[PDB]
Ligand binder design. Structure first.
Ligand SMILES: Nc1ncnc2c1ncn2[C@@H]1O[C@H](COP(=O)(O)OP(=O)(O)O)[C@@H](O)[C@H]1O
Lengths: 186, 742
């Protein structure tokens, strides 16, 4: 069968199929809601726009990210984002597809636990696994040693690896990233 | 049995041969009906019921296993070949299929099925249509005589004469499966019991102007033909009337990927009349004309040139002149010229203006209007605001929708007026009393790319099937009030009306579609979203689509009586709009042709005047269906079901999938299912005794003693005063105990 590789991070959901050369779907991980009242009846306005649709209606929505620094803070929003990724961007049924999720080193334990619980109860995937975002970088770089600096959008971290052995006591994590650079530029 | 002339065998086999065929072994336990792969259900035997494992030994030598949850008994031999399917001891789906299968192999065409009359067409001549059986039936009853349409014809006649009311014959089948000739023999029988030549003579006109190639048929009828056969006070032939209903207009503009427009455009495109082409500026190339080229250009349907000639002959022998045929042909050519018009937006505005003017000039020169004037009437309509006129603005989409609606309107207008001319030719001055109408309508068509038109067709057939179902309900209440046994006072119509309420009712599919083509920036995805938001789950029959075997596409699925149908949304908004242009209609009223008669006049204190823009094909269709129901619901109806045995012209051999398709889409299965809730096996006491007295050999006391000594439960049988009512299980158990008694 085929496996799904969903890289959430925070600020860009990017998913696809295992064995491909690049992600198939790449879109912001935002969930917008209309903040005005709506006058035209018959428009049939929906109540929340997730993904790339929310970027076109920026003018009338209020955008929220459900992942602050690696950790997930709005579980309902994250559930909506996963539903959108599975059914509207990829158009696959998650009942017959193992899913590989990623997270950053040194996150709360309940984050990963509840991610698993959702992926099994709500979406009914047959299997799943959670990988560290730096080990995967080292895989894709064609190395087996090296220290990897994975500066995403919510979290930056170093993970030194040697011959395939990670040294956990030397892992650094810094909560300065692209979102803070955006706020500083603002 | 000699009263049936030479047709006696085909009409009904002798009692002697019946009994000689009765002697045949049949195991009631291990020869039950079994699901199949190549077909649905095949004749086979089971070796044993090994848990969840059985083995069906069919005739083909196969030994497949089927699950214990999909097996059901086969009809007993003592009740095979039954004339009335309703009297079958076990009412299953493939049961009736094999019944009619053996009946057509044994070459018995007609078969009673309760309130229906089913007729599989024989492909070779039979003596059953000789006038001897026609004349000799006079004096025999429906309940006893074997099935045939002459029976129901006479029953309708005598019903008319006793109740002083109209009757209705509803012949139901596919064009090219024998409907024409079935109605022909009907009208022959009616003339016999006392103008058919005129009917058949004017028929090619309707065949031209109301038939088009679909996928299932190359001569499919689109309009609802319906011939009213009036009579006098003395029940003698007086005159005949005809009306057209539900003629689909969308065909004149949009055609599917696999189908053509109406036949007439192609028949004119046959160069065998070069005078028509050089007088209408019609180039030979059919790809040239956009209204038509989107459909199937040409197919091996018929000899279209010869059909053009046959229609011209029928025209010249009909009451109307040669100039009138000339105007008809030129008007159709003008409709054809409408499609190639070209419009562009203006310089720095949102107004439509024509760039190409040549087809405009030629279409005006044909229609009898001015070209500049017609272009002005299309680009700048004028509307009435109180006591003044102000000019309305249009863009390209709006002017194109207006052009399409104008073409559909003029075509349908010419069609209705042609039917009026036909009826005027037919008209005889004899006084016309109560009539008996015969109705020809489209079928419950299913495909893999159902669309708006198929939804309209299925909605019509839903109204018809619900009508018949309520009719049969009142008929069963009549049987019960006669028998003095009255129970189960629920009607049989609402269970189907619940599906109608999902099309016509406000917030139903048609209302949502109308609202969506009224809204400013509506799209197909928004239409789908509104359908789902307003029906999904909150309804009972509306539900998700299904993707099977890689079908093309489906956006939602309804369930009907004839099964689950998946419909496609794409194009509905664009194809439902019918904005008629009032200024151009006035131009037509001021023409220099016959056109001014067709468009004679068409568009405070309480006015239901819907605007010109608030017009939808679905709404006009709902209105027409309403008035057709109002015309039918005043007459006592009768129903005729026509089935093709096989797609090949070779008789004898059939196609079980095609038989099942016809049964489902026709509603014979729905009739037997309405029966299956009461007591369908209904037999008197005398023959009951003569057949089951040896079980307890010795009228209510002895029957009751036998029943109590046969271990029959109370709710399983209903005790009547002339007939005692039993179900399938009761018949099976009584059969088994007789068999062990012997
Ligand atoms: N060319 C670029 N130059 C600078 N910053 C960039 C560029 N492209 C993306 N970014 C930043 O990277 C962040 C996205 O990082 P990403 O790898 O998607 O992390 P995550 O997947 O956790 O969101 C965004 O906040 C954006 O501001």
């Amino acid at each position: 069968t085929t496996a799904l590789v969903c890289d959430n991070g925070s600020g860009l959901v990017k998913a696809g199929f295992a064995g491909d050369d690049a992600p198939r779907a790449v879109f912001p991980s935002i969930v917008g809601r209309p903040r005005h009242q709506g006058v035209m009846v018959g428009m049939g306005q929906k109540d929340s726009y997730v993904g790339d649709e929310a970027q076109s209606k920026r003018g009338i929505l209020t955008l929220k990210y459900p992942i602050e620094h690696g950790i997930i803070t709005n579980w309902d929003d994250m559930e909506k984002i996963w539903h959108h990724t599975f059914y509207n961007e990829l158009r696959v049924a998650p009942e017959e597809h193992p899913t590989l999720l990623t997270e950053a080193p040194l996150n709360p334990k309940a984050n990963r636990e509840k991610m698993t619980q959702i992926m099994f109860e709500t979406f009914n995937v047959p299997a799943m696994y959670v990988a560290i975002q730096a080990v995967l970088s080292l895989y894709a770089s064609g190395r087996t040693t090296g220290i990897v600096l994975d500066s995403g959008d919510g979290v930056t971290h170093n993970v030194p690896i040697y011959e395939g052995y990670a040294l956990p006591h030397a892992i650094m994590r810094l909560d300065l990233a692209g979102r803070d650079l955006t706020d500083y530029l603002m | 049995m000699a009263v049936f002339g030479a047709a006696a065998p085909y009409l009904r086999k002798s009692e002697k041969e019946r009994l000689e065929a009765q002697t045949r072994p049949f195991d009631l336990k291990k020869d039950v009906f079994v699901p199949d792969d190549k077909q649905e259900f095949v004749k086979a035997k089971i070796v044993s019921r090994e848990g969840g494992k059985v083995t069906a030994e069919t005739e083909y030598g196969k030994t497949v296993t089927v699950k214990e949850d999909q097996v059901m008994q086969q009809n007993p031999p003592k009740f095979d070949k039954i004339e009335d399917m309703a009297m079958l001891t076990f009412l299953h789906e493939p049961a009736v299929l094999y019944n009619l299968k053996d009946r057509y192999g044994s070459w018995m065409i007609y078969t009673y099925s309760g309130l229906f009359c089913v007729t599989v067409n024989p492909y070779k001549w039979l003596p059953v249509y000789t006038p001897e059986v026609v004349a000799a039936y006079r004096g025999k009853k429906r309940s006893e005589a074997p099935p045939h349409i002459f029976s129901i014809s006479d029953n309708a006649y005598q019903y008319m004469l006793t109740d002083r009311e109209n009757q209705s014959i509803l012949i139901t089948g596919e064009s090219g499966a024998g409907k024409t000739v079935n109605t022909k023999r009907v009208i022959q029988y009616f003339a016999v019991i006392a103008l058919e030549d005129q009917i058949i003579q004017a028929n090619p006109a309707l065949e031209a102007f109301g038939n088009a190639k679909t996928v299932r048929n190359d001569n499919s009828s689109r309009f609802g033909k319906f011939i009213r056969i009036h009579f006098g006070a003395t029940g003698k032939l007086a005159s005949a009337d005809i009306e057209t209903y539900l003629l689909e207009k969308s065909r004149v503009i949009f055609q599917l990927k696999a189908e053509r427009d109406y036949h007439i455009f192609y028949q004119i495109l046959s160069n065998k009349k070069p005078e028509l082409l050089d007088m209408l500026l019609i180039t030979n190339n059919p790809y040239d004309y956009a209204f038509i080229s989107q459909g199937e250009t040409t197919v091996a349907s018929i000899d279209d040139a010869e059909e053009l000639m046959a229609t011209d002959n029928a025209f010249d022998v009909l009451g109307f002149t040669s100039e009138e045929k000339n105007s008809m042909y030129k008007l159709t050519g003008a409709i054809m010229h409408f499609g190639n018009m070209k419009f562009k937006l203006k310089q720095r505005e949102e107004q439509a203006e024509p760039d190409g003017t040549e087809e405009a000039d030629k279409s005006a020169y044909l229609m009898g209007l001015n070209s500049a004037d017609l272009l002005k009437g299309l680009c700048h309509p004028r509307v009435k605001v109180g006591n003044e006129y102000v000019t309305k603005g249009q863009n390209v989409q709006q002017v194109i929708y207006a052009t399409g609606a104008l073409a559909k309107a003029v075509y349908e207008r010419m069609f209705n007026w042609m039917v009026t001319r036909i009826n005027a030719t037919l008209e005889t001055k004899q006084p016309r009393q109560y009539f008996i109408g015969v109705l020809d309508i489209a079928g419950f068509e299913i495909f893999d790319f159902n669309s708006f038109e198929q939804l309209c067709i299925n909605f019509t057939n839903e109204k018809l099937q619900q009508f018949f179902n309520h009719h049969m309900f009142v008929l069963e209440q009549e049987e019960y009030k006669k028998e003095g046994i009255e129970w189960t006072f629920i009607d049989f119509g609402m269970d189907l009306q619940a599906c109608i309420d999902l099309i016509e009712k406000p917030m139903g599919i048609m209302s949502i579609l109308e609202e969506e083509c009224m809204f400013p920036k509506a799209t197909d995805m928004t239409f789908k979203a509104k359908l789902f938001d307003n029906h999904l789950g909150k309804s009972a029959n509306f539900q998700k689509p299904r993707n099977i075997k890689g079908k093309p596409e489906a956006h939602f699925s309804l369930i009907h009586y004839a099964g689950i149908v998946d419909y496609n949304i794409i194009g509905w908004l664009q194809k439902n709009k019918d904005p008629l242009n009032e200024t151009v209609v006035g131009l037509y009223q001021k023409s220099s042709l016959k056109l001014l008669s067709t468009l004679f006049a068409n568009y405070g204190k309480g006015k239901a005047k819907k605007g010109s823009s608030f017009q939808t094909v679905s709404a006009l269709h709902r209105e027409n269906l309403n008035k057709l129901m109002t015309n039918l619901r005043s007459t006592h109806p009768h129903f005729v079901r026509c089935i093709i045995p096989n797609e090949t012209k070779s008789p004898g051999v059939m196609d079980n999938p095609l038989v099942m398709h016809q049964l489902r889409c026709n509603g014979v299965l729905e009739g037997i299912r309405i029966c299956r809730k009461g007591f369908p096996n209904r037999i008197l006491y005398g023959d009951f005794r003569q057949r089951y007295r040896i079980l307890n050999p010795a009228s209510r006391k002895g029957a009751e003693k036998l029943l109590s000594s046969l271990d029959i439960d109370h709710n399983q049988y209903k005790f009547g005063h002339t007939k005692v009512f039993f179900k399938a299980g009761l018949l099976g158990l009584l059969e088994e105990m007789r068999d062990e008694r012997l």
